[PDB]
Amino acid sequence: SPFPLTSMDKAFITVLEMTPVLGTEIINYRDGMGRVLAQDVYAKDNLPPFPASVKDGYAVRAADGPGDRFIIGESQAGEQPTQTVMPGQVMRVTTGAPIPCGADAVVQVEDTELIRESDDGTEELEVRILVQARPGQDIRPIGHDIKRGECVLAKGTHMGPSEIGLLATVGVTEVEVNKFPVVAVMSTGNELLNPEDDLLPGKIRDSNRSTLLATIQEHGYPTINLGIVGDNPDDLLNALNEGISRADVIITSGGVSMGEKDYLKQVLDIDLHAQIHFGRVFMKPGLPTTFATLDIDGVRKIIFALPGNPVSAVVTCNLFVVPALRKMQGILDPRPTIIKARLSCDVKLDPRPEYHRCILTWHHQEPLPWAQSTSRLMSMRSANGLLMLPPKTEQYVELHKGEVVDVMVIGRL
Amino acid sequence: SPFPLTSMDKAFITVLEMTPVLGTEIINYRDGMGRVLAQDVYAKDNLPPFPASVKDGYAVRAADGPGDRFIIGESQAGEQPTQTVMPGQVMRVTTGAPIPCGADAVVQVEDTELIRESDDGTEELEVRILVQARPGQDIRPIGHDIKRGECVLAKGTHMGPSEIGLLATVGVTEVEVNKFPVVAVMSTGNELLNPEDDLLPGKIRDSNRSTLLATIQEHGYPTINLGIVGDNPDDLLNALNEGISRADVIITSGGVSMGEKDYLKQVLDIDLHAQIHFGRVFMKPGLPTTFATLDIDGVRKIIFALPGNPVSAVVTCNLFVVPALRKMQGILDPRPTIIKARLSCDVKLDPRPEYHRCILTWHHQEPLPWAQSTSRLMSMRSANGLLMLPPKTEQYVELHKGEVVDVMVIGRL
Ligand SMILES: Nc1ncnc2c1ncn2[C@@H]1O[C@H](COP(=O)(O)OP(=O)(O)O)[C@@H](O)[C@H]1O
Ligand SMILES: Nc1ncnc2c1ncn2[C@@H]1O[C@H](COP(=O)(O)OP(=O)(O)O)[C@@H](O)[C@H]1O
Ligand SMILES: CO[C@H]1O[C@@H]2O[C@@]3(C)CC[C@H]4[C@H](C)CC[C@@H]([C@H]1C)[C@@]24OO3
Ligand SMILES: CO[C@H]1O[C@@H]2O[C@@]3(C)CC[C@H]4[C@H](C)CC[C@@H]([C@H]1C)[C@@]24OO3
Ligand SMILES: [Ca+2]
Ligand SMILES: [Ca+2]
Ligand SMILES: [Ca+2]
Ligand SMILES: [Ca+2]
Ligand code: NA
Ligand code: NA
């Protein structure tokens, strides 16, 4: 128009406020990594479901005290005992085996001495108990860890390996979760060739599509590759319509500044009738970043039209797209983690808030990491942070090596 | 035997020293996430491959100075111009378009005023240049960003999205990388049922297999599910032989303490003829953790026999297995990231170094994160750290809330 310069705060809040939460589906628990539960999950059994030994040793009567005992048998892991321990008797137990009737404590083998075994040294017959056990010692009573009827996982839980293991424990193998967003990515520009092409005069290879798709995939979301689209409104409209049909989220790059052949914003508004919430952001890089929604058939589609410059595209993808995707897949607080780190070099501040990929490194002595902006060993590592520099003011015009700055985590630390 | 209590330092060093690096394979660049390059990668083209405009504006002769100029045409993105700019002339350019012959600078449109356009307002004819440009301004010369013949990625680089984008840029779509390890996981114990089973007397559901497989999958490595194996040497040997055939790494859990039906270490030594490098570790939890190698047909197989206790299994998997897998897939320094964090509560120290899953959280004010050991909102989050508590000494017997401790990162922050 030009569109108003939207502040970074307002643009980010607008993305989260306008992005929908996807519907739910039932999945197998093994497919639950990174999913958010849409239901509370309850145990239908006690854990342990029988009183269970914590130790290799003997199930005893605490009231017998220390002394010499006849071993009446062994409680085997996986088998309910049938014998009752009576005074002067014990039963051998292993870790995880059930406690027999008549015993109220376990004495670990280290607190015993063997007296007699069968001539074939395969059976223990008599043992000396060297300690006074307390009732209940080294036994997990029924339900000690989980009780039947207990809610073991709450709706809203963002699951990792231990939550999957908990579902396995309680036998809840099918769970309701939010869907993951399907994200379509297209590149735009008459100068672009595919990565697989040799160069032709006036042309370059499309890198943004690969970088953006890889970024989305790294977060676990399914993607659709919509290819390269030329700088013309008909082709852009057709590609957007395909994205809308096939995906929940459409990411484009290129064609969002005010250039003679930058058509995306016109197509979004005039042809698609999408609502453009912002078309410029007061940020460096990323000035022409554009965010639109399209409500069709009771469904809200999300469209990010990112800048064409490759660094701008990947930075703005991490700032705006990834948090939106996290909200869509049901994460209750979708904001990225921000950590404090020390600047590795002096920096002159821009009037705009400025963002730069960096590598966070901890030195085993120092409490704060260093942020090295993108060495023989550092060239081996991928960026895992986005430095977040404050706007310059009449007071603060520069920051110095060692000073503390905010860094958004964008990769595995 | 019992096996010697191996110090944590020695056990960890032994794992890394004895673990092999896998062989290489050629992959498509799109499949490169998390891979390590086994070759240097070179650009075969310049970037840009033509002198490219940084701006929407006009390609000018700097020597003409400011003034009124005839527009002789437009350089289009993706098209080599054919006209030569002569004195008193300019050519319209867009960002990324080639600079025509005869021009040596770009003046952005904001530093100009239009004089005349065609009656049909679709063609600019005459423009006022308001600034004195410097030769080269707002042009990326050929090779400014990447030069033909330049090494753009070194062998040993652990690739993320931006490295994939760089491969796309230079058109190197096939790259040599280290293989990922195939990791087989089995559970052991006569008391175990599958997650899909209803409980039977004396039995519990196998959770370790799910938790361990999910942990490995979270790191991107292919897995093989070897199921549940009973406490008997024949079945254990057969399952290990299947793992050895199908996988690079075999993980078991259970059956590694000194109990009457704990057979794994006997099978590994006597039947498989594997070399057990350690069979106990002075750590809490994880005392019976076992690490073995098996050299067969010039190939080194890796076997981790982890403790059966579910918390021990997941802790020891993160401490020993994940670093080994990182070395196998070619990461040069496979050690996890260790960060400094503040303890959320007082802790009594054990004679053994102690490890506990926790959640790291940053508060937007404070420089160090807090480590909360595994709240309405915190129950929504998965563990992302492993607290690393030091052994007790005659001097240090306890640590207090707020004191700084080491935390190993085990999840996305
Ligand atoms: N997919 C892409 N891969 C690599 N470079 C790109 C890609 N798309 C655009 N570019 C380049 O980025 C720069 C800006 O492109 P442009 O389409 O003008 O972005 P915008 O108009 O959104 O600011 C140009 O140099 C252009 O060639
Ligand atoms: N896969 C599993 N899932 C859940 N619990 C398990 C699993 N394997 C073993 N356990 C339990 O862990 C505890 C220790 O098992 P055990 O086989 O004695 O380990 P180890 O001998 O290696 O110390 C027992 O209570 C046992 O039932
Ligand atoms: C409202 O926008 C402000 O908060 C936001 O939330 C968080 C918690 C998360 C990171 C970051 C968000 C990605 C962009 C906006 C900035 C700030 C400008 C951001 O910083 O910190
Ligand atoms: C040699 O073992 C010591 O260093 C190791 O390396 C690092 C850098 C990485 C984490 C951790 C490793 C997983 C276990 C051993 C500890 C220590 C006991 C560990 O701490 O810090
Ligand atoms: Ca363009
Ligand atoms: Ca443009
Ligand atoms: Ca067992
Ligand atoms: Ca055991
Ligand atoms: Na930009
Ligand atoms: Na253990």
Choose which residue among B7, B8, B15 to substitute to test ligand 4 binding: the one with the highest number of ligand atoms within 8 A of its C-beta.
B8
Q: Distance between CA A170 and CA A173 in Å, rounded?
A: 8
Contact present, A140 and A170 (Cβ < 8 Å):
no
Tokens 């595209």 belong to which residue?
A313
B14 alpha carbon – ligand 7 mean position (Å):
26
Q: Which residue of B has its CA nearest to A212?
A: B161
Q: How far is A297 from chain B (nearest CA, A)?
A: 32
CB contact under 8 A, B204 and A161: no
CA of B6 to the centre of ligand 4 (A): 14
- Note the resolution in Å, 1 decimal: 1.5
Block residue for tokens 């579910």 = B310
Fold for domain B24-47+146-179? Molybdopterin biosynthesis moea protein, domain 2 (3.90.105)
Closest-CA residue to B12 (of B295, B322, B245): B322
- The approach used to solve this structure was X-ray
What tokens were used for B134? 């410097």
Q: How far is A112 from chain B (nearest CA, A)?
A: 14
CATH topology assigned to domain A338-413: Beta-clip (2.40.340)
Angstrom distance (rounded) from CA B159 to CA A256:
29
Q: Could you tell me which of A215, A337, A318, A412 has the C-alpha nearest to residue B331? A: A412
H or E element that contains B299: strand B299-306
3-class SS string, B362-374 = CCCCCCCCEEEEC
Beta strands in B118-171 (DSSP E): 124-129, 139-140, 151-153
User: With a 6 A CB cut-off, is A353 part of the ligand 1 pocket?
Assistant: no
Q: Does the beta-carbon distance from B195 to A380 stay under 8 Å?
A: no
Pairing between β-strand A89-93 and β-strand A67-75 as defined by DSSP bridges = parallel
Tokens 């005074």 sit on residue: A87
- Phi first, then psi, for residue A233 (nearest 5°) are -65, -35
Beta-bridge mates of residue B53: B139
Residue carrying the six token digits 């490098």: B277
Torsion of CA A61, A62, A66, A72, to 10 degrees: 10
Specify whether the CB–CB gap between A171 and B205 falls below 8 A.
Answer: yes
Strands B385-389 and B354-361: antiparallel
Give yes or no for residue B333 CB within 6 A of ligand 4: no
Q: Which two tokens stand for residue A106?
A: 């376990």
Q: What is the interface size between A and B, counted as CB pairs within 8 Å?
A: 278
- B37: nearest CA in chain A? A380
Question: Residue A11: what are its φ and ψ, rounded to 5°?
Answer: -65, -45
CB B18 within 8 A of CB B40: no
Cβ-proximal residues to A384 (8 Å cutoff; 6+ apart), any chain: A358, A359, A360, A409, A410, A411, A412, A413
| DSSP codes, B228-286 | EE-SSHHHHHHHHHHHHHH-SEEEEES--SS-TT--HHHIIIIIT--EEEESEES-BS-
Which residue do the tokens 């058939």 mark? A297
Q: E strand or H helix at B18, and its extent?
A: helix B8-18
- Which tokens belong to A271? 């042809």
- Is the distance from CB of A6 to CB of A280 less than 8 angstroms? yes
What is the rounded distance in angstroms from the CA atom of residue A413 to the CA atom of residue A117?
A: 56
Class of domain B48-145: mainly beta
Which amino acid is it at B149?
G
Backbone angles phi, psi at B205, to 5 degrees: -85, 140
Query: Measured between alpha carbons, how far is A233 from A250 in angstroms, rounded to an integer?
Result: 16
| Helix count and strand count (H, E) for chain B | 7, 29
The dihedral formed by the CA atoms of A239, A245, A249 and A254, expressed in degrees to the nearest 10? 0
Task: Name the token pair of B165.
Answer: 């984008």
Query: Which residues have CB under 8 Å from B287's CB, separation 6+?
Result: B5, B257, B280, B281, B307, B352
Q: Does B285 contact ligand 2 (Cβ within 6 A)?
A: no
Give the residue whose CA is nearest to atom 4 of ligand 3: A9
Beta strands A249-253 and A299-306: pairing type?
Answer: parallel
What are A178's two structure tokens? Answer: 């939010």
Instruction: Domain ranges for chain B, please list them.
Output: 1-23+180-337, 24-47+146-179, 48-145, 338-413
Q: Tell me if residue B64 falls in helix, strand or coil.
A: helix
Instruction: Determine the Cα–Cα distance for residues B15 and A146; give it in Å rounded to an integer.
Output: 35
Chain B residues within an 8 Å CB radius of A411: 160
Shortest distance, CA A295 to any CA of chain B (angstroms): 30
Mutate to test the pocket of ligand 4, among B10, B12, B354 (most ligand atoms within 8 A of CB): B12
**Domain spanning A1-23+180-337, CATH class:** alpha beta
What's B120's DSSP letter?
A: S
Indicate whether residue B319 lines ligand 4 (CB < 6 A): yes
Q: What is the DSSP letter of B36?
A: B
The residues placing their C-beta within 5 Å of ligand 5, an ion, are A 189, 254-255
Closest-CA distance of chain B to residue A306, Å = 15
Q: Count CA within 13 A, CB hemisphere, residue A267.
A: 21
Q: Residues A220, A34: contact at Cβ < 8 Å?
A: yes
Q: Is A335 in the pocket of ligand 3 (CB under 6 A)?
A: yes
- Residue whose CA is closest, atom 17 of ligand 2? B254
Phi then psi dihedrals of residue B264, to 5 deg: -60, -45
Residue B48 CA to residue B274 CA, distance in Å, equals 56
Show Cβ contacts of residue A21 under 8 Å, excluding neighbours closer than 6 positions.
A178, A327, A328, A330
Cis geometry, peptide bond prior to residue B285 (ω within 30 degrees of 0): yes
User: 10 Å Cβ neighbour count for B293?
Assistant: 17
Return the H-helix or E-strand segment holding B410.
none
**Cα-to-chain-centroid distance, residue A358:** 21
Spell out which residues of chain B touch residue A138, defining contact as CB-CB under 8 Å. Answer: none
3-state secondary structure chain A: CCCCEECHHHHHHHHHHHCCCCCEEEEEHHHCCCCEECCCEECCCCECCCCEECCCEEEECHHHCCEEEEEEEEECCCCCCCCECCCCEEEEECCCCECCECCCEEEEHHHEEEEEECCCCCCEEEEEECCCCCCCCCEECCCCCECCCCEEECCCCECCHHHHHHHHHHCCCEEEEECCCCEEEEEECCCEECCCCCCCCCCEECCHHHHHHHHHHHCCCCEEEEEEECCCHHHHHHHHHHHHHHCCEEEEECCCCCCCCCCHHHHHHHHCCCEEEECEECCECCCCCEEEEEEECCEEEEEEEECCCHHHHHHHHHHHHHHHHHHHCCCCCCCCCEEEEEECCCEECCCCCEEEEEEEECCCCCCCCEEEECCCCHHHCCCCEEEEECCCCCCCCEECCCCEEEEEECCCC
Q: Read off the tokens for A334.
A: 């979708």
Residues with CB under 5 A from ligand 8 (ion): A 95; B 257, 259, 262
